[PDB]
Amino acid sequence: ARKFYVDQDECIACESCVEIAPGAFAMDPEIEKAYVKDVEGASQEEVEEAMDTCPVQCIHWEDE
Amino acid sequence: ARKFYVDQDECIACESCVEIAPGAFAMDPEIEKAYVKDVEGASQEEVEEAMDTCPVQCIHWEDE
Ligand code: SF4
Ligand code: SF4
Protein backbone atom coordinates (compact mmCIF):
# COMPACT_ATOMS: atom_id res chain seq x y z
CA ALA A 1 0.00 0.00 0.00
CA ARG A 2 1.43 3.47 -0.72
CA LYS A 3 2.44 4.73 2.80
CA PHE A 4 0.44 7.41 4.62
CA TYR A 5 0.47 8.80 8.19
CA VAL A 6 -1.35 11.40 10.40
CA ASP A 7 0.64 14.52 11.44
CA GLN A 8 -0.71 14.45 14.93
CA ASP A 9 0.64 17.94 15.80
CA GLU A 10 -1.98 19.37 13.53
CA CYS A 11 -4.82 16.88 14.12
CA ILE A 12 -8.04 18.52 15.43
CA ALA A 13 -9.67 15.20 16.56
CA CYS A 14 -12.81 15.70 14.38
CA GLU A 15 -13.02 11.89 13.88
CA SER A 16 -14.02 12.07 10.16
CA CYS A 17 -11.19 9.63 9.12
CA VAL A 18 -12.18 7.01 11.68
CA GLU A 19 -15.76 7.38 10.31
CA ILE A 20 -14.70 7.07 6.62
CA ALA A 21 -11.91 4.48 7.01
CA PRO A 22 -12.38 2.54 10.29
CA GLY A 23 -10.02 -0.33 9.42
CA ALA A 24 -7.14 2.14 8.73
CA PHE A 25 -7.66 4.95 11.33
CA ALA A 26 -8.36 4.92 15.08
CA MET A 27 -8.33 7.58 17.86
CA ASP A 28 -5.55 7.38 20.52
CA PRO A 29 -7.65 7.46 23.74
CA GLU A 30 -5.08 9.34 25.76
CA ILE A 31 -3.59 11.97 23.41
CA GLU A 32 -6.87 12.57 21.48
CA LYS A 33 -5.25 12.49 18.07
CA ALA A 34 -6.03 10.04 15.26
CA TYR A 35 -3.27 7.62 14.06
CA VAL A 36 -2.94 4.94 11.35
CA LYS A 37 -3.73 1.56 12.93
CA ASP A 38 -3.32 -0.33 9.60
CA VAL A 39 -1.81 0.89 6.29
CA GLU A 40 -3.68 -1.96 4.51
CA GLY A 41 -6.98 -1.35 6.37
CA ALA A 42 -8.73 0.66 3.61
CA SER A 43 -8.41 0.69 -0.18
CA GLN A 44 -6.32 3.48 -1.69
CA GLU A 45 -9.52 5.35 -2.78
CA GLU A 46 -11.02 5.24 0.73
CA VAL A 47 -7.72 6.51 2.14
CA GLU A 48 -7.81 9.39 -0.35
CA GLU A 49 -11.41 10.17 0.61
CA ALA A 50 -10.34 10.47 4.26
CA MET A 51 -7.30 12.57 3.32
CA ASP A 52 -9.34 14.96 1.16
CA THR A 53 -11.90 15.31 3.95
CA CYS A 54 -9.40 16.09 6.75
CA PRO A 55 -10.31 19.73 7.75
CA VAL A 56 -6.69 20.50 8.63
CA GLN A 57 -5.06 18.35 5.85
CA CYS A 58 -2.74 16.43 8.24
CA ILE A 59 -2.80 12.94 6.64
CA HIS A 60 0.04 12.81 4.15
CA TRP A 61 1.39 10.26 1.71
CA GLU A 62 4.98 9.19 2.32
CA ASP A 63 6.54 8.09 -0.88
CA GLU A 64 9.44 10.11 0.25
CA ALA B 1 -14.87 -0.99 -7.83
CA ARG B 2 -14.45 -4.40 -6.01
CA LYS B 3 -17.41 -6.68 -5.38
CA PHE B 4 -16.94 -9.55 -2.99
CA TYR B 5 -19.37 -11.03 -0.49
CA VAL B 6 -19.59 -13.93 2.02
CA ASP B 7 -21.69 -16.99 1.10
CA GLN B 8 -23.35 -17.16 4.47
CA ASP B 9 -24.66 -20.76 3.94
CA GLU B 10 -21.12 -21.97 4.31
CA CYS B 11 -19.72 -19.53 6.81
CA ILE B 12 -18.72 -21.30 10.02
CA ALA B 13 -18.33 -18.02 12.03
CA CYS B 14 -14.60 -18.53 12.87
CA GLU B 15 -14.13 -14.67 12.68
CA SER B 16 -10.69 -14.73 10.95
CA CYS B 17 -11.99 -12.34 8.22
CA VAL B 18 -13.29 -9.68 10.66
CA GLU B 19 -9.94 -10.09 12.61
CA ILE B 20 -7.83 -9.59 9.50
CA ALA B 21 -9.96 -6.92 7.71
CA PRO B 22 -12.28 -5.17 10.27
CA GLY B 23 -13.11 -2.23 8.05
CA ALA B 24 -14.47 -4.58 5.30
CA PHE B 25 -16.04 -7.46 7.33
CA ALA B 26 -18.38 -7.67 10.33
CA MET B 27 -20.37 -10.35 12.19
CA ASP B 28 -24.15 -10.19 11.80
CA PRO B 29 -24.88 -10.88 15.53
CA GLU B 30 -28.35 -12.22 14.77
CA ILE B 31 -27.37 -15.18 12.61
CA GLU B 32 -23.72 -15.18 13.66
CA LYS B 33 -22.42 -15.18 10.07
CA ALA B 34 -19.89 -12.83 8.51
CA TYR B 35 -20.80 -10.31 5.73
CA VAL B 36 -19.08 -7.49 3.83
CA LYS B 37 -19.94 -4.14 5.44
CA ASP B 38 -17.73 -2.08 3.04
CA VAL B 39 -16.16 -3.28 -0.18
CA GLU B 40 -13.53 -0.47 0.00
CA GLY B 41 -12.84 -1.20 3.73
CA ALA B 42 -9.50 -3.04 3.11
CA SER B 43 -6.84 -2.99 0.39
CA GLN B 44 -7.07 -5.65 -2.32
CA GLU B 45 -4.15 -7.50 -0.64
CA GLU B 46 -5.78 -7.44 2.78
CA VAL B 47 -9.03 -8.80 1.24
CA GLU B 48 -7.00 -11.63 -0.35
CA GLU B 49 -5.45 -12.44 3.04
CA ALA B 50 -9.00 -12.83 4.41
CA MET B 51 -10.24 -14.89 1.40
CA ASP B 52 -7.26 -17.25 1.44
CA THR B 53 -7.51 -17.64 5.21
CA CYS B 54 -11.26 -18.44 5.15
CA PRO B 55 -11.45 -22.15 6.36
CA VAL B 56 -14.50 -22.88 4.18
CA GLN B 57 -13.50 -20.70 1.19
CA CYS B 58 -16.88 -18.96 1.32
CA ILE B 59 -15.75 -15.38 0.56
CA HIS B 60 -16.02 -14.86 -3.22
CA TRP B 61 -15.29 -12.30 -5.88
CA GLU B 62 -18.31 -11.41 -7.91
CA ASP B 63 -18.10 -13.14 -11.25
CA GLU B 64 -16.43 -16.35 -9.90
S1 SF4 C 1 -9.80 13.75 9.69
FE1 SF4 C 1 -7.83 14.90 10.15
S2 SF4 C 1 -8.24 16.35 11.91
FE2 SF4 C 1 -9.97 14.84 11.72
S3 SF4 C 1 -9.41 13.27 13.26
FE3 SF4 C 1 -8.63 12.48 11.20
S4 SF4 C 1 -6.46 13.25 11.03
FE4 SF4 C 1 -7.43 14.36 12.77
S1 SF4 D 1 -13.23 -16.31 7.67
FE1 SF4 D 1 -14.85 -17.46 6.44
S2 SF4 D 1 -15.90 -18.96 7.87
FE2 SF4 D 1 -14.62 -17.46 9.07
S3 SF4 D 1 -16.19 -15.90 9.68
FE3 SF4 D 1 -15.20 -15.11 7.75
S4 SF4 D 1 -16.47 -15.87 6.03
FE4 SF4 D 1 -17.12 -17.00 7.89
Coordinates of all heavy atoms in Angstrom, one line a residue, chain B residues 5-8 10-18 20 25-27 32-35 50-51 53-59, ligand 2:
Chain B
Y5 N -18.3 -10.8 -1.5 CA -19.4 -11.0 -0.5 C -19.1 -12.4 0.2 O -18.3 -13.2 -0.3 CB -20.7 -11.1 -1.2 CG -20.8 -12.2 -2.3 CD1 -21.2 -13.4 -1.9 CD2 -20.3 -12.0 -3.6 CE1 -21.2 -14.4 -2.8 CE2 -20.3 -13.0 -4.5 CZ -20.8 -14.2 -4.1 OH -20.8 -15.3 -4.9
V6 N -19.8 -12.7 1.3 CA -19.6 -13.9 2.0 C -20.8 -14.8 1.6 O -21.9 -14.3 1.6 CB -19.5 -13.7 3.5 CG1 -19.6 -15.0 4.3 CG2 -18.3 -12.9 3.9
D7 N -20.6 -16.1 1.3 CA -21.7 -17.0 1.1 C -22.0 -17.5 2.5 O -21.3 -18.4 3.1 CB -21.3 -18.1 0.2 CG -22.2 -19.4 0.1 OD1 -23.4 -19.3 0.4 OD2 -21.7 -20.4 -0.3
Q8 N -23.0 -16.9 3.1 CA -23.3 -17.2 4.5 C -23.8 -18.6 4.7 O -23.7 -19.1 5.9 CB -24.4 -16.1 4.9 CG -23.8 -14.7 5.1 CD -24.7 -13.7 5.7 OE1 -25.9 -13.7 5.5 NE2 -24.2 -12.7 6.4
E10 N -22.3 -21.2 4.0 CA -21.1 -22.0 4.3 C -20.3 -21.5 5.5 O -19.5 -22.2 6.0 CB -20.3 -22.0 3.1 CG -20.7 -23.0 2.0 CD -20.6 -24.5 2.5 OE1 -19.6 -24.9 3.0 OE2 -21.6 -25.2 2.3
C11 N -20.5 -20.2 5.8 CA -19.7 -19.5 6.8 C -19.8 -20.3 8.1 O -20.9 -20.5 8.6 CB -20.2 -18.1 7.0 SG -19.2 -17.2 8.3
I12 N -18.7 -20.7 8.7 CA -18.7 -21.3 10.0 C -18.4 -20.3 11.2 O -18.0 -20.7 12.3 CB -17.7 -22.5 10.0 CG1 -16.3 -22.0 9.7 CG2 -18.2 -23.5 9.0 CD1 -15.2 -23.1 9.9
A13 N -18.7 -19.0 11.0 CA -18.3 -18.0 12.0 C -17.0 -18.0 12.8 O -16.9 -17.6 14.0 CB -19.5 -18.0 13.0
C14 N -15.9 -18.6 12.3 CA -14.6 -18.5 12.9 C -14.0 -17.1 13.2 O -13.1 -17.0 13.9 CB -13.6 -19.2 11.9 SG -13.2 -18.3 10.4
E15 N -14.6 -16.0 12.5 CA -14.1 -14.7 12.7 C -12.8 -14.3 12.2 O -12.4 -13.1 12.3 CB -14.2 -14.2 14.1 CG -15.7 -14.2 14.7 CD -15.7 -13.6 16.0 OE1 -15.2 -14.2 17.0 OE2 -16.2 -12.5 16.2
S16 N -12.0 -15.1 11.5 CA -10.7 -14.7 11.0 C -10.8 -13.6 10.0 O -10.0 -12.6 10.1 CB -10.1 -15.9 10.2 OG -9.9 -17.0 11.1
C17 N -11.8 -13.5 9.1 CA -12.0 -12.3 8.2 C -12.3 -11.0 8.9 O -11.9 -9.9 8.5 CB -13.1 -12.6 7.2 SG -14.7 -13.2 7.9
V18 N -13.0 -11.0 10.0 CA -13.3 -9.7 10.7 C -12.0 -9.3 11.5 O -11.8 -8.1 11.7 CB -14.6 -9.7 11.6 CG1 -15.7 -10.4 10.8 CG2 -14.4 -10.5 12.8
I20 N -8.8 -10.1 10.5 CA -7.8 -9.6 9.5 C -8.3 -8.3 8.8 O -7.4 -7.4 8.7 CB -7.6 -10.7 8.4 CG1 -6.7 -11.8 9.0 CG2 -6.9 -10.2 7.2 CD1 -6.8 -13.1 8.2
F25 N -15.2 -6.4 6.9 CA -16.0 -7.5 7.3 C -16.6 -7.2 8.7 O -15.9 -6.6 9.6 CB -15.3 -8.8 7.4 CG -14.8 -9.3 6.0 CD1 -13.6 -8.9 5.6 CD2 -15.6 -10.1 5.2 CE1 -13.1 -9.4 4.4 CE2 -15.2 -10.6 4.0 CZ -13.9 -10.2 3.6
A26 N -17.8 -7.7 9.0 CA -18.4 -7.7 10.3 C -19.2 -8.9 10.6 O -19.6 -9.6 9.7 CB -19.3 -6.5 10.5
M27 N -19.5 -9.3 11.9 CA -20.4 -10.4 12.2 C -21.8 -9.8 12.2 O -22.0 -8.7 12.8 CB -20.1 -11.0 13.5 CG -18.8 -11.7 13.6 SD -18.7 -12.9 12.3 CE -19.8 -14.2 12.9
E32 N -25.1 -14.9 13.5 CA -23.7 -15.2 13.7 C -23.0 -15.7 12.4 O -22.4 -16.8 12.3 CB -23.6 -16.1 14.9 CG -23.4 -15.1 16.2 CD -23.7 -15.6 17.7 OE1 -24.1 -16.8 17.9 OE2 -23.6 -14.8 18.6
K33 N -23.1 -14.9 11.3 CA -22.4 -15.2 10.1 C -21.7 -13.9 9.7 O -22.1 -12.8 10.1 CB -23.4 -15.5 9.0 CG -23.5 -17.0 8.7 CD -24.5 -17.7 9.5 CE -24.2 -19.2 9.6 NZ -24.6 -19.9 8.4
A34 N -20.6 -14.0 8.9 CA -19.9 -12.8 8.5 C -20.5 -12.2 7.3 O -21.3 -12.9 6.5 CB -18.5 -13.2 8.2
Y35 N -20.4 -10.9 7.0 CA -20.8 -10.3 5.7 C -19.9 -9.1 5.4 O -19.1 -8.6 6.3 CB -22.3 -9.9 5.8 CG -22.6 -8.7 6.7 CD1 -22.7 -7.5 6.1 CD2 -22.7 -8.9 8.1 CE1 -22.8 -6.4 6.9 CE2 -22.8 -7.7 8.9 CZ -22.8 -6.5 8.3 OH -22.9 -5.3 9.0
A50 N -7.8 -12.3 3.8 CA -9.0 -12.8 4.4 C -9.6 -14.0 3.6 O -10.0 -15.0 4.2 CB -10.0 -11.7 4.6
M51 N -9.7 -13.8 2.3 CA -10.2 -14.9 1.4 C -9.5 -16.2 1.5 O -10.1 -17.3 1.5 CB -10.2 -14.4 -0.1 CG -11.3 -13.4 -0.2 SD -11.5 -12.8 -1.9 CE -11.9 -14.3 -2.7
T53 N -7.4 -17.1 3.9 CA -7.5 -17.6 5.2 C -8.9 -18.3 5.5 O -8.9 -19.2 6.3 CB -7.2 -16.5 6.2 OG1 -5.9 -16.1 6.0 CG2 -7.4 -17.0 7.7
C54 N -9.9 -17.9 4.8 CA -11.3 -18.4 5.1 C -11.3 -20.0 5.2 O -11.2 -20.5 4.1 CB -12.3 -17.9 4.1 SG -14.0 -18.5 4.7
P55 N -11.4 -20.7 6.3 CA -11.4 -22.2 6.4 C -12.4 -22.9 5.4 O -12.2 -24.0 5.0 CB -11.7 -22.4 7.8 CG -12.3 -21.2 8.4 CD -11.5 -20.1 7.6
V56 N -13.6 -22.3 5.1 CA -14.5 -22.9 4.2 C -14.5 -22.3 2.8 O -15.4 -22.6 2.0 CB -16.0 -22.9 4.8 CG1 -16.0 -24.0 5.9 CG2 -16.4 -21.5 5.4
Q57 N -13.6 -21.4 2.5 CA -13.5 -20.7 1.2 C -14.8 -20.1 0.7 O -15.3 -20.4 -0.4 CB -12.9 -21.7 0.2 CG -11.4 -21.9 0.5 CD -10.5 -20.7 0.2 OE1 -10.3 -20.3 -0.9 NE2 -10.0 -20.0 1.2
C58 N -15.5 -19.4 1.6 CA -16.9 -19.0 1.3 C -16.9 -17.5 1.0 O -18.0 -17.0 0.7 CB -17.8 -19.3 2.5 SG -17.5 -18.4 4.0
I59 N -15.8 -16.8 0.9 CA -15.7 -15.4 0.6 C -15.4 -15.4 -0.9 O -14.4 -15.9 -1.3 CB -14.6 -14.6 1.4 CG1 -14.8 -14.8 2.9 CG2 -14.8 -13.1 1.1 CD1 -13.6 -14.3 3.7
Ligands
SF4_2 S1 -13.2 -16.3 7.7 FE1 -14.8 -17.5 6.4 S2 -15.9 -19.0 7.9 FE2 -14.6 -17.5 9.1 S3 -16.2 -15.9 9.7 FE3 -15.2 -15.1 7.7 S4 -16.5 -15.9 6.0 FE4 -17.1 -17.0 7.9

